[PDB]
From a paper:
Phosphoglycerate mutases (PGMs) catalyse the interconversion of 2- and 3-phosphoglycerate (2-PG; 3-PG) in the glycolytic and gluconeogenic pathways. The enzymes have no amino-acid sequence similarity and differ in their mechanism of catalysis. iPGM is comprised of ∼510 amino acids and facilitates the intramolecular transfer of the phosphoryl group on the monophosphoglycerates through a phosphoserine intermediate and is the sole PGM in nematode. The iPGMs are monomeric bi-domain enzymes where a phosphatase domain, structurally related to the alkaline phosphatase family of binuclear metalloenzymes, is connected by two hinge peptides to a phosphotransferase domain8.
In a subsequent crystallization effort, using an 18 amino-acid N-terminal truncated form of C. elegans iPGM, we prepared a pre-formed Ce-2 complex purified by sizing chromatography, as well as a mixture with Ce-2d. The latter resulted in needle-like crystals diffracting to 1.95 Å. A relatively small region of the total Ce-2d peptide surface makes direct contact to iPGM (127.1 Å2) with the remaining area (305 Å2) exposed to solvent as it is positioned within an open pocket between the phosphatase and transferase domains. The three extra-cyclic C-terminal residues, Tyr9, Leu10 and Tyr11 are wrapped close to the core macrocycle, with the carboxamide of Tyr11 visible on the exterior surface of this compact structure and pointing toward the metal ion active site. The model places the macrocycle at a site non-overlapping with phosphoglycerate supporting an allosteric binding mode for the ipglycermides.
Author numbering:
A (entry chain C): 1 to 11
B (entry chain A): 20 to 549
The structure:
């Protein structure tokens, strides 16, 4: 959630 | 309102259905089986089916879509490449050698004491890092001519099996000796110590003291695999490896050294990197002197509050649709119920908390029930009510909403509730459509990814996940026809450019998606002439 494309965007 | 509201050629209402994919298989398909007369008509004739998963939305191949990536890509009019995909492209296309921050770090070492360090999780886990990236960094650092390079190997055993580290170690030693003939392994320590994220600074200190002062077991290239095997025989696995120290003092992080962390996942890099590159070394409470004048680089941004340069800093994401409308002095309206409010704000606007000039927001409370299968219509009716009021007012040339039920009820895995969720959503869409025709808006309906079209696994069990199916893109304006891009399937990155084309507005250079409509007149000229 901290920047667009970080690891949370995988889910 | 905003000064240029009347410059638009067409006012657009964009509906983003959450979790509504296009699948012809009727088994467990709550959309097909639900009564959906409105979408049955909107998804006929001139409509499109666009991709919302995998590389089409910047995610690794084969990965289902989701609400965060989906609203991001719809809002941005470009593919935002997820870290893994982005870095892998850089490795494939030999772009590390010209990476601005990597060149910066190598220039610092070369203009300084010549000494550079690589530190991260060494395995093929791919959750926090990948060994392939570390190998690519070593080859680029060599080509860039850095005098001295040391590797600090963090043992995994969590994203890979607990005894695989010896293999990654063997791979690394051979890569350094035979493939590059350049670079030296300096430390091995388990991620339990190096990669804590719970403010257990006594664990960080074990890794810190290994790197700074060589506190650990002395070994060398010839002996280190055997040390690890002895650790394994004593039930000390990769995640928990106590420090092993190679190269002696020269391999420690010393005054004036430069250090790159290669993990791309920030959460477990924050502590060790702040210990090295800021003031959190105090928290380690070590008797060792902290080296002066270190510079720290991260593979990605670990915290905005850190001074560290990043090899792959965040996509700037300038001129997403919401920023671009404001720059064009066109006002806008974003509406969702509680469960998807972040998605129509933070995520749609580019993955940050920013509200642009002229942007009006509307939150509709989601129902207070234990689980949403108990009220499958959720608050779709309220969202439609708020959109209809904006259509009647005519204030905003671009309005958009989210409909939550298909996704949120889909996650309960209750098929009959999912059917009702889709029926209520279709009713709401119909009411918005009638209002757009009355009040002079063009309606476009899409989705952020699928879900409710697949409620059953093949064995008959519940399917509670998003999908890889395409999503619809509809358009009520009969002056345009859909046309696919030349070289790829259409995708969520094409929605915003298409909106702008219909609205008669310019497309910013930062939107590298393409409009996937064509005016009939222009298609007619292209036909009769080409
Ligand atoms: Cl960008
Ligand atoms: Mg149906
Ligand atoms: Mn979901
Ligand atoms: Zn979603």
């Amino acid at each position: 959630x901290d920047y667009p494309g970080d690891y949370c965007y995988l889910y | 309102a905003m000064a240029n509201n009347s410059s638009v050629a067409n006012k657009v209402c964009l509906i983003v259905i959450d979790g509504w994919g296009v699948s012809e298989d009727p088994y467990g398909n709550a959309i097909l089986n639900a009564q959906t007369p409105v979408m049955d008509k909107l998804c006929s004739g001139n409509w499109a089916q666009i991709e919302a998963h995998g590389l089409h939305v910047g995610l690794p191949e084969g990965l289902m879509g989701n609400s965060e990536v989906g609203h991001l890509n719809i809002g941005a009019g470009r593919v935002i490449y997820q870290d893994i995909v982005r870095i892998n492209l850089a490795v494939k296309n030999n772009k590390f050698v010209t990476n601005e921050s990597l060149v910066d770090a190598c220039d610092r070492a070369k203009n300084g004491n010549g000494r550079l360090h690589l530190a991260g999780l060494v395995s093929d886990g791919g959750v926090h890092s990948h060994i392939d990236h570390m190998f690519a960094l070593v080859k680029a650092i060599k080509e860039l001519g850095v005098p001295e390079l040391y590797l600090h190997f963090y043992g995994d055993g969590r994203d890979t099996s607990p005894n695989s580290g010896v293999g990654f170690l063997e791979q690394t030693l051979e890569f350094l000796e035979k493939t590059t003939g350049y670079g030296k392994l300096a430390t091995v320590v388990g991620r339990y110590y190096a990669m804590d994220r719970d403010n257990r600074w006594e664990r960080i200190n074990v890794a810190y003291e290994a790197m700074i002062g060589g506190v650990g077991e002395t070994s060398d290239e010839a002996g280190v695999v055997e040390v690890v095997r002895k650790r394994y025989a004593a039930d000390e696995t990769d995640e928990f490896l106590k420090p092993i120290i190679l190269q002696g003092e020269k391999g420690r992080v010393q005054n004036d050294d430069t250090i790159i962390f290669f993990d791309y996942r920030a959460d477990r890099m924050r502590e060790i990197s702040a210990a090295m590159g800021m003031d959190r070394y105090k928290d380690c409470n070590s008797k060792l002197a902290h080296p002066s004048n270190l510079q720290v680089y991260g593979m990605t941004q670990y915290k905005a509050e850190f001074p560290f340069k990043s090899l792959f800093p965040p996509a700037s994401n300038k001129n997403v649709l919401a920023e671009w409308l404001a720059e064009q002095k066109v006002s806008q309206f974003h509406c969702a119920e509680t469960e998807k409010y972040a998605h129509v704000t933070f995520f749609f606007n580019g993955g940050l908390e920013k509200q642009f000039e002229g942007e009006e927001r509307c939150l509709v409370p989601s129902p207070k029930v234990a689980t949403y299968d108990l009220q499958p219509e959720m608050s779709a009716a309220g969202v439609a009510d708020k959109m209809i009021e904006q259509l009647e007012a005519g204030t905003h040339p671009f309005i958009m909403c989210n409909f939550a039920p298909p996704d949120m009820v889909g996650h309960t895995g209750v098929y009959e509730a999912a059917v009702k969720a889709c029926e209520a959503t279709d009713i709401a869409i119909g009411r918005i459509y009638e209002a757009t025709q009355k009040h002079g808006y063009s309606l476009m309906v899409t989705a952020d990814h699928g879900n409710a079209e697949k409620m059953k696994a093949p064995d008959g069990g519940k399917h509670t996940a998003h999908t890889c199916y395409r999503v619809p893109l509809t358009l009520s304006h009969p002056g345009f026809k859909f046309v696919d891009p030349a070289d790829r399937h259409p995708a969520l990155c094409d929605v915003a450019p298409t909106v702008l084309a219909i609205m008669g507005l310019p497309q910013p250079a930062e939107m590298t998606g393409v409009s996937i409509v064509q005016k009939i007149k222009l298609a007619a000229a292209l036909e009769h002439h080409h």
